[PDB]
Ligand SMILES: O=C(c1cc(Cc2n[nH]c(=O)c3ccccc23)ccc1F)N1CCN(C(=O)C2CC2)CC1
């Protein structure tokens with residue numbers, strides 16, 4: 699029961715989502731190996747994801763977490779990249795298909811840096827790149843990210859040197875401590891704690 703509403707570039711909601719994509723690009727320590735070499739995106743489309751059952755599932759869990767956390771859902775808007783974005787928007791996030799080999803445990807991963815999420819769009823470490831050209835830095839093929847509403851509740855703070863949530867915590871904050879320009883990553887252990895609100899289609903742009 700998911701429908702996708704296409705947003706006009708003139709819509710303020712399009713502009714604020716775009717800004718959140720563009721302004722959270724950073725350089726990656728892999729020199730572009732996983733996600734490609736770029737400083738910005740060409741945003742081709744932004745669609746709002748609408749699915750009543752998934753939304754009600756989201757807001758129900760949110761109220762639970764809120765009540766376990768001095769009335770604070772600790773809701774963020776975070777990026778998620780994956781080859782299975784088309785399954786996430788119809789069926790929601792599935793915690794049995796989590797990142798099993800994740801740095802912060804088996805669970806569903808999100809990023810503050812759009813470019814970190816961009817690294818997973820074609821697979822872990824970027825897989826083998828785009829399906830057409832096998833190119834992790836393809837400037838031609840269309841990529842997709844989700845910009846998602848995520849309940850973190852009480853988040854366990856894990857500093858990093860870059861399954862189930864810790865007892866009495868609702869999520870994990872994975873916070874880089876060596877790269878001072880790297881923003882955080884987050885892990886949730888329940889699919890109902892994220893709702894995939896926006897589906898963003900884009901290309902990476904070749905630096906001039
Ligand atoms: O959380 C993951 C996952 C995440 C990753 C890593 C990851 N993926 N995407 C990111 O944006 C990201 C950001 C920071 C750190 C890690 C990531 C790898 C494999 C995975 F299966 N999911 C994969 C796809 N999921 C699904 O429900 C779809 C139906 C199969 C659930 C969520």
Ligand SMILES: [Zn+2]
Pocket residue numbers: 828829830831832833836837838839
């Ligand atoms: Zn390509």
